[PDB]
Ligand binder design. Structure first.
Ligand SMILES: [K+]
Lengths: 169, 340, 85
């Protein structure tokens, strides 16, 4: 078989489960969108990629991701050699609108750079938590001060739009 | 117009029925009939006008773009797209190919041209594609059904061609054909062009059907040098078709079933439980609990657990809160406390 | 009974035995002859000594062999899947 078969099999099982319990069309939708994404090559793509030593990949990164990391203001160190050091260790990741990326619990593990799309930044409070901290957009950073000074990533973020976020160790 | 209009679908079903009729009639018109009779005048005419009307109406239908999720409604571009792929064949097939034969000095090649009308099987192909996209019907059963229709159409067409090959030989030298040499039981096919249409058709189809199943009784076989070369090709193609059918049924079965999964689970359980030498009452308790577990569809929890990525929130919110606020220990608590 | 020729039985000449009056033979000879035909047609051997000869028998044989072709594919699939597991 092929991936078009794994998609259909998982979606058939999901339809059985959902219609067996009469869930509802809005979530039907949320689910459908999510399922679709996992199956698409975007993911298994980067994963498989792996192997390719790195020397070779290095060029793949510097040909795909270089302008994206160069257009963020935070990186005005002006040393394009430093920037090529940055690109050589980037890994993509896609999250659908409504996905939790980082919150207070998780300490810093990676530099989540935000690509085309909107990810919601929020924090918590003691009555309904807190809403509307910041609406991150393209050519910006996200989750940097934690590696800069001290571990722990505040400003709980749950993404609000599709985005091809990068990630550096 | 919109690719999903109310009646446009009604027209699609009408034209699907007509396409099935024409696909199943054209080989029979070509083979068993050296020129359509007078009685079958209006049937051909009506079929032609129906498919021409479909051509005209398809000329006025918006098409969904492929690389990009936009359905275009540009009349010039729907023109261009239709006139590229499926216009020339559908127009050529629409011409009267019986009146032309009975006007152009009765030449054979204008009748050989009748096989253009087999291009209407694209309608059934697209119908099966639509059925495959639909979520009501499993993908692999749809593939098996499509292969079963392909086999039957190929068998019917092969029967028509096999009877046709017995009319190329001159009527005087009819004792050297697959038909005209039969002596089935008491009946002998002496003048096989003077029997009813259905007798000849059923004999030819009987040969083709017991050949596609690889039974091959041998009461009807090939005799001429042109009937041998046809059966070689037919059986060589049928072999791969049958292998495909077996493979698709095997895949459908090997996907799995609930009883199979339960029996594997109980296999592991009984192995572990006999290995450790536990008591029989414990065996009964464990087997009863696991039987209820698999009867209750417990395995859906892990299936949902595999990367839904937090859209579980509203699923649980709409599924469990009915039993949550009712319990006399949550009375007057916070809403987000309930949700969490 | 007049046209007991032009029938799958009544036009049989197995060995030196002729099924002349196929309504007076022992029930078991008729039954096991018919079963013999049906089984060599479900196993797709088809020896050809016993074959359909009328137009009411050709149709039944066509239906039966189509159904048995699907069934045999199904049995092969089940055995193959259980061996593969
Ligand atoms: K055989």
């Amino acid at each position: 078989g092929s991936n078009t078969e794994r998609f259909r099999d998982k979606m058939n099982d999901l339809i059985s489960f959902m219609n067996r319990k009469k869930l509802g069309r809005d979530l039907r939708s949320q689910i459908t969108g999510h399922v679709r994404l996992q199956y698409d090559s975007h993911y298994t793509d980067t994963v498989m990629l792996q192997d390719i030593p790195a020397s070779i990949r290095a060029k793949i990164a510097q040909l795909l991701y270089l302008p994206y990391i160069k257009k963020v203001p935070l990186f005005k160190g002006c040393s394009t050699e430093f920037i090529n050091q940055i690109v050589i260790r980037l890994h993509e990741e896609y999250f659908l609108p409504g996905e939790v990326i980082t919150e207070q619990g998780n300490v810093v593990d990676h530099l989540y750079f935000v690509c085309e799309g909107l990810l919601e930044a929020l924090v918590t409070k003691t009555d309904g938590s807190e809403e509307s901290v910041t609406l991150l957009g393209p050519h910006t950073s996200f989750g940097d001060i934690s590696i800069i000074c001290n571990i722990s990533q505040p400003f709980t973020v749950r993404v609000c739009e599709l985005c091809h976020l990068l990630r550096l160790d | 117009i919109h690719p999903k209009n109310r009646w446009y679908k009604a027209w699609e079903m009408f034209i699907l029925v007509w396409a099935i009729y024409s696909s199943l009639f054209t080989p029979m018109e070509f083979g068993f009939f050296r020129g359509l009779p007078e009685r079958l005048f209006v049937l051909d005419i009506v079929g032609q006008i129906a498919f021409l009307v479909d051509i005209v109406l398809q000329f006025f239908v918006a098409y969904r773009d492929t690389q990009t999720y936009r359905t275009v409604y540009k009349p010039t571009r729907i023109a261009f797209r239709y006139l590229k792929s499926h216009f020339l064949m559908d127009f050529i097939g629409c011409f009267p190919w019986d009146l032309i034969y009975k006007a152009s000095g009765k030449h054979e090649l204008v009748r050989y041209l009748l096989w253009i009308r087999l291009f209407r099987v694209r309608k059934v192909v697209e119908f099966f594609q639509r059925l495959e996209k639909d979520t009501r019907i499993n993908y692999l059963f749809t593939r098996i059904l499509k292969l079963l229709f392909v086999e039957v159409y190929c068998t019917h067409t092969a029967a028509c061609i096999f009877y046709y090959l017995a009319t190329t030989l001159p009527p005087e030298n009819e004792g050297y054909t697959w038909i005209g040499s039969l002596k089935l039981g008491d009946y002998s096919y002496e003048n096989f062009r003077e029997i009813d249409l259905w007798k000849r058709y059923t004999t030819a189809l009987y040969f083709a059907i017991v050949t596609m199943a690889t039974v091959g009784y041998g009461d009807i076989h090939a005799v001429n040098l042109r009937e041998m070369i046809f059966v070689m090709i037919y059986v060589s193609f049928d072999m791969v078709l049958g292998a495909y059918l077996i493979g698709n049924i095997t895949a459908l079965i090997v996907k799995g079933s609930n009883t199979e999964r339960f029996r594997d689970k109980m296999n592991d359980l009984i192995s572990f439980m006999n290995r450790k030498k536990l008591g029989r009452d414990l065996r009964s308790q464990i087997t009863g609990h696991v039987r209820l577990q698999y009867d209750s569809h417990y395995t859906d929890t892990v299936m949902l657990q595999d990367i839904p990525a937090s859209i579980r929130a509203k699923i649980a919110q709409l599924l469990y809160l009915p039993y949550i606020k009712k319990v006399p220990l949550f009375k007057g608590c916070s809403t987000e406390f309930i949700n969490q």
